[PDB]
Design a protein around this ligand. Sequence first.
Ligand SMILES: [Zn+2]
Ligand SMILES: [Zn+2]
Ligand SMILES: [Zn+2]
Lengths: 266, 266, 266
Amino acid sequence: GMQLTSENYYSQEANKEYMSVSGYKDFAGTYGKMPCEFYGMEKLNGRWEDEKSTALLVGSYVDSYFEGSLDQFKKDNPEIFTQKGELKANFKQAEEIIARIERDEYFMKYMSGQKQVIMTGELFGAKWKIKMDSYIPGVAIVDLKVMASITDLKWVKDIGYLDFVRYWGYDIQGAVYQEIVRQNTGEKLPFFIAGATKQTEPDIRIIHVTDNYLQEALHMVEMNMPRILRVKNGEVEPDRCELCDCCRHNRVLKKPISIMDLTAGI
Amino acid sequence: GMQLTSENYYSQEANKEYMSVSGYKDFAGTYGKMPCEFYGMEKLNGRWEDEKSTALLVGSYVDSYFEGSLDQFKKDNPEIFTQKGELKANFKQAEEIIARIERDEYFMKYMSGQKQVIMTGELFGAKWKIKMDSYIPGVAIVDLKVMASITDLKWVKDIGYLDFVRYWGYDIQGAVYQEIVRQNTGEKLPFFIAGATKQTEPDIRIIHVTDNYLQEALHMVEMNMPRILRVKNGEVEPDRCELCDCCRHNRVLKKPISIMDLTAGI
Amino acid sequence: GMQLTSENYYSQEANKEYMSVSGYKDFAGTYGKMPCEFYGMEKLNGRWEDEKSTALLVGSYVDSYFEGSLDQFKKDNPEIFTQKGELKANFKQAEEIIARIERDEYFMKYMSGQKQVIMTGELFGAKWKIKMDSYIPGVAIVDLKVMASITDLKWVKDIGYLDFVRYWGYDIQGAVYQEIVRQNTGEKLPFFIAGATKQTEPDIRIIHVTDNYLQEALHMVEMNMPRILRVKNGEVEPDRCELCDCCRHNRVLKKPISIMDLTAGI
Ligand SMILES: [Zn+2]
Ligand SMILES: [Zn+2]
Ligand SMILES: [Zn+2]
């Protein structure tokens, strides 16, 4: 069993040995992003690395501020600065958001736990790994998210308006995080998202994702994992969504499509 | 009774003594912008000033051109120029729009009235103030608006597609302007919006907002003013929409929300 | 009968003597663009030339690469370069797209025909002209299109979701191209769009637009041409959509509109 560390948590070998919330979503998707098994297998092999995104980089900048690892973050990610030397605007806003969080005592209490805590477990067939933004032992699991909007609802076909937690599958993250802590600690802890937005005056909220929602999502994880396990173990060929950048990079045409192909399925 | 002037019309003390069309909307809102009583009270106190907007600044640039006060506008608003010295593109387009207006005789006739005329009155409980772009005594009240689109319709829930006049509450502006002139002049004058757009060839129109629409909106003003008057006089605590920048700047968290809070109301 | 050439195909006199797929759409429109007869007549007269668009210029850059006329394209279109000398980003992406196409053998086979082939014919009242990106004699007519998306469907009122081919009237282009080749060759050839997208990994597809769709569109052309012919021959005054830049440039106001005018037709 591989001993995971801060340096190696995201490693290729860390990801082969341990399913992760992020791993699962590659295969299973969320309301906001189609599943794609191929994409998930190409990431594992190391034959596809994503172009790093402004949104993710903002969010890691802020994680790094709270962990006290900002100097090294900046060193490892020179693309956050202009050629002239100054932080690009999205990051000057990141500091605006941090200051906004810091002047709220209540919000700062949820951020007061152990920082980037790695834990391990067994679920539905595989070993898993988690890494929690702010963990307060015996009281709460907190995840910081920096997003465009907390209050915006999004339309889902045949379901209707959905809040951001269920839409982006943060119900999945909470469920797994909770359960893995439970296998290490015995304690079943509540899950809170500490949200801040990139609006011009940031919106701040602590959002409790209740155990009824965590339970329904841990169930869905259970239903999908067997198919996932089959694909990761070379036991079946992964499907391609044919709608992601990985799919498009790897396509090799052999036949014409027609209009039927564009309108298939309504 | 305070004697209003061009220099002091928008002053803090001018706004405490006089309700205005803009004042009313802060409290009462339009189809395009939620009401927020708090925002309205923080603007009055002087504890919240809005970040000046490109759209508003374009529009004031054009007002200032027609009043012959452009030199001083430019002096008071240095942020309309690049650091290198040139007018930012939105303002180089503003001059494009002005030239487009100027080559239309018909449009120029509606713009030929007295410029930025201040009048005063009494309505539904308070003193009010108005300031009209182009006033032709005994014939018409004209308001210049520079917008994205004249012809675009916008969907309103349980109402359907709405034209820009009703959607942005310019029916309110017209109604009040008309009535206050009527209390000074005796004459009930028609209200026209002289619209130009920021499309790449600007769309130009003179739009008559008829007295049936003005009447229905002056009615709505009447229904809402008592609640407004209560709030401005410290007789009740103002509600917060919790969806504007003022609300967000001023929020002090004390409790967690949940998904119920995000989906409340459909 | 005017002998058309590469140099003169798009000339004012080439367009008076020959209807073209592009000519037809000016008058008849597509699901994606309102018809406007006036616009069509002002383009013919030479009293309206369109501001050249980034999208069209990208697409011509790529045509020019395959024809071996890129040096001269660049000379004739200096606005594709920054003042500092480098290709603007949209064109650095155009080369990315070209390289992506070139590494696909199947796609390159459809691109292997004669390049920018001009043909002429008679249909429904007028002489017509066509110019085909890649023509393989006795096998296929191929048109290269560089677009935002191949898979995106667009909503059309009282019709519903429509694929890009029918939405933008490429069914019209295919139908006419096919028929004119048939009047020169005797051979009825299949029509393929060789599509590539501007997504960050370009989507590539060969799309066969089948003869049932070409037939329904050649029919619509037939129904609309008499009205078109009347307008081009000065036999009736062209209507103005009043929603395009040409219409707006040419408007001369004489009367006020009202809200009825904005909401006419639902
Ligand atoms: Zn995929
Ligand atoms: Zn508010
Ligand atoms: Zn038009």
